[PDB]
Amino acid sequence: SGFRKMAFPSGKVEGCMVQVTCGTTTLNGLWLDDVVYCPRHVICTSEDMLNPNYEDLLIRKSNHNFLVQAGNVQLRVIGHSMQNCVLKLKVDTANPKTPKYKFVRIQPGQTFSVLACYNGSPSGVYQCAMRPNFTIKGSFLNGSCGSVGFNIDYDCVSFCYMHHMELPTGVHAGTDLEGNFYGPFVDRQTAQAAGTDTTITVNVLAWLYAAVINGDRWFLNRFTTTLNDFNLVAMKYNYEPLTQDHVDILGPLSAQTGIAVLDMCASLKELLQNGMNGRTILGSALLEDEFTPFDVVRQCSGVT
Amino acid sequence: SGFRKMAFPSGKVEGCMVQVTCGTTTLNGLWLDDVVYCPRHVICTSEDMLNPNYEDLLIRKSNHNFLVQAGNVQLRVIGHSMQNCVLKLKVDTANPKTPKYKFVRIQPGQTFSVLACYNGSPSGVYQCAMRPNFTIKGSFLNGSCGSVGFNIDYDCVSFCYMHHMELPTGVHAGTDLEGNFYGPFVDRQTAQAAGTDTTITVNVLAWLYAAVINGDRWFLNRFTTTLNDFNLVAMKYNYEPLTQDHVDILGPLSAQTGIAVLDMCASLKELLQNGMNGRTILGSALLEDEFTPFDVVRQCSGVT
Numbered sequence: 001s002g003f004r005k006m007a008f009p010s011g012k013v014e015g016c017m018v019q020v021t022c023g024t025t026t027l028n029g030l031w032l033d034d035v036v037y038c039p040r041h042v043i044c045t046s047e048d049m050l051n052p053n054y055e056d057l058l059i060r061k062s063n064h065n066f067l068v069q070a071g072n073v074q075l076r077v078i079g080h081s082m083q084n085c086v087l088k089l090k091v092d093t094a095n096p097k098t099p100k101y102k103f104v105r106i107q108p109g110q111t112f113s114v115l116a117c118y119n120g121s122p123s124g125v126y127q128c129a130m131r132p133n134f135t136i137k138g139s140f141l142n143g144s145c146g147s148v149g150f151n152i153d154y155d156c157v158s159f160c161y162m163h164h165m166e167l168p169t170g171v172h173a174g175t176d177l178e179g180n181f182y183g184p185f186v187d188r189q190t191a192q193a194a195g196t197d198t199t200i201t202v203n204v205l206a207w208l209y210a211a212v213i214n215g216d217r218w219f220l221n222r223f224t225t226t227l228n229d230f231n232l233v234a235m236k237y238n239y240e241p242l243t244q245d246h247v248d249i250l251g252p253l254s255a256q257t258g259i260a261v262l263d264m265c266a267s268l269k270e271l272l273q274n275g276m277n278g279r280t281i282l283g284s285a286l287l288e289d290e291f292t293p294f295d296v297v298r299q300c301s302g303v304t
Numbered sequence: 305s306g307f308r309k310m311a312f313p314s315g316k317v318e319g320c321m322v323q324v325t326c327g328t329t330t331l332n333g334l335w336l337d338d339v340v341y342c343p344r345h346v347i348c349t350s351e352d353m354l355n356p357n358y359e360d361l362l363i364r365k366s367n368h369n370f371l372v373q374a375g376n377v378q379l380r381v382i383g384h385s386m387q388n389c390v391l392k393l394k395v396d397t398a399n400p401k402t403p404k405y406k407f408v409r410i411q412p413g414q415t416f417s418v419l420a421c422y423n424g425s426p427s428g429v430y431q432c433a434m435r436p437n438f439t440i441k442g443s444f445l446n447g448s449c450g451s452v453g454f455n456i457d458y459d460c461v462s463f464c465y466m467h468h469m470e471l472p473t474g475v476h477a478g479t480d481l482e483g484n485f486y487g488p489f490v491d492r493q494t495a496q497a498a499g500t501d502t503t504i505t506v507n508v509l510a511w512l513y514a515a516v517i518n519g520d521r522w523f524l525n526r527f528t529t530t531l532n533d534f535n536l537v538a539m540k541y542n543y544e545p546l547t548q549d550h551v552d553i554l555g556p557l558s559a560q561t562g563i564a565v566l567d568m569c570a571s572l573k574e575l576l577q578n579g580m581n582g583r584t585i586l587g588s589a590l591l592e593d594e595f596t597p598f599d600v601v602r603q604c605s606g607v608t
């Protein structure tokens with residue numbers, strides 16, 4: 001027993017990290033097969049970031065301007081192309097450490113692990129959620145650009161995120177591995193509004209189930225609610241509306257604990273209206289929404 | 305910016321995980337050079353755990369009874385010895401993936417990453433602290449025995465913990481890599497008291513500094529305190545007494561922020577006496593003590 005904010009083992013991703021330098025800018029790249037992927041702003045100087053014309057800036061670069069180093073060894077760049085906000089540098093050597101992988105575009109509310117890197121070197125790994133407003137609340141310093149987010153299913157790494165920037169509010173924005181931003185963001189040094197965020201209701205419910213499984217049950221009550229009634233409360237507290245699709249994915253947790261989804265909704269409704277009254281759930285004094293129902297099942301069943 | 309409960313990249317440790325089976329019991333082992341380390345209770349059946357005589361149980365085992373598999377390949381066991389609560393199985397092949405490593409016995413209040421494993425396969429990684437009472441609050445299911453805790457300094461992995469058991473209270477106990485338990489615990493299926501735990505004061509202060517660095521400053525006040533006065537408050541709230549050694553290790557954070565350690569103590573004193581008043585600090589509604597001053601400096605400076 002016990003329930004932690006667990007990240008995937010990062011080894012398979014560590015083997016893909018490289019450093020990419022272009023001019024005086026250095027950031028991280030992801031070396032999979034014979035291609036290195038990195039944020040296209042590696043071609044910018046500080047003055048370029050105000051309003052970069054990436055097509056013109058990239059035209060001034062040749063293959064030999066992209067310096068790619070995998071730890072201590074240098075990669076030879078034989079091609080370069082821009083796809084959306086990512087640069088793809090074709091190298092003459094396939095990464096011998098390339099794991100089985102896929103590129104996926106995750107949905108808001110889904111979770112993933114981030115391998116924070118600097119200068120091509122891994123510093124740490126943490127789990128986070130893609131907020132409903134397509135930002136992430138990560139831990140990224142200058143030079144963390146190019147660090148990636150991923151999930152792992154047995155031997156396959158599904159890369160879902162590449163870090164690009166920090167908004168003036170301190171939250172983070174990035175792209176899928178095809179270089180498409182999550183959210184309305186553009187790779188430019190301009191103030192940009194992130195939408196109104198909400199709490200991921202299905203994840204809070206999943207975490208309440210994890211709490212019951214692991215022994216924290218004080219919040220269980222004698223009440224029930226309906227999807228309609230619960231959604232009036234969810235609206236008032238800036239929670240995502242719960243749908244039958246969310247109830248369906250909570251089914252395994254409802255079956256394991258014997259607590260009907262709408263009964264757990266009534267516990268969550270009471271917690272929203274009354275707070276925790278100085279108590280904690282799974283070591284938290286707030287309602288946690290960074291665990292999906294799948295994360296709860298995986299951790300509670302020991303999936304490797 | 306941003307501050308997360310970050311674990312070390314687990315790759316170097318993943319390469320050392322093996323499965324160890326003896327009779328009908330299977331758990332994890334750590335393969336470093338030509339030795340595999342694992343909890344000695346791998347030699348017990350369920351009936352043995354009530355009061356095991358490990359010396360007698362181990363006498364019934366020979367090298368060929370210890371089945372060690374590193375992923376898909378089998379290791380040949382050429383020796384076995386018990387050291388405290390760990391078994392050391394000498395194998396005929398040195399682990400080609402052995403990183404530079406050390407065995408360290410950590411102090412209470414220090415932090416480390418755990419690579420949760422099942423059947424020799426890594427499932428996840430998380431950061432935690434060794435509680436002042438020598439327990440850890442981890443996420444461990446049956447078969448997680450043998451999973452290890454570690455810290456990494458550039459290329460060196462310092463292994464500090466090997467998982468052995470879950471107390472009836474749901475907290476976890478284990479040993480250093482020489483098989484000495486942290487705390488008063490014995491490897492037996494008997495109810496065992498963990499001491500009164502306390503909150504790691506120096507870590508809470510370090511985390512308050514991380515909050516100021518990352519923009520959360522609402523808790524800063526116009527007050528100061530003394531070590532003596534603060535320690536009266538620490539005693540009342542079951543916090544560890546603060547010493548000048550703790551003030552000394554907070555020095556870099558005090559210098560960076562310009563907030564004297566005793567001034568931060570007065571903020572912590574006010575938070576203990578008044579609570580958070582429905583506010584949060586670094587996404588938490590309670591006072592976090594799983595970040596050491598070194599963790600805060602490392603994360604705030606991007607150490608790889």
Ligand SMILES: *CC(=O)N[C@@H](CO)c1cccc(Cl)c1
Binds near residue numbers: 146188189
């Ligand atoms: C990773 C990062 O923050 N990069 C910096 C440039 O170093 C940046 C600023 C503004 C926008 C973008 Cl896309 C990146």
Ligand SMILES: *CC(=O)N[C@@H](CO)c1cccc(Cl)c1
Binds near residue numbers: 345468469490491
């Ligand atoms: C890892 C674990 O919990 N092991 C179990 C036996 O499978 C155990 C029970 C009681 C004491 C000890 Cl040391 C281990």
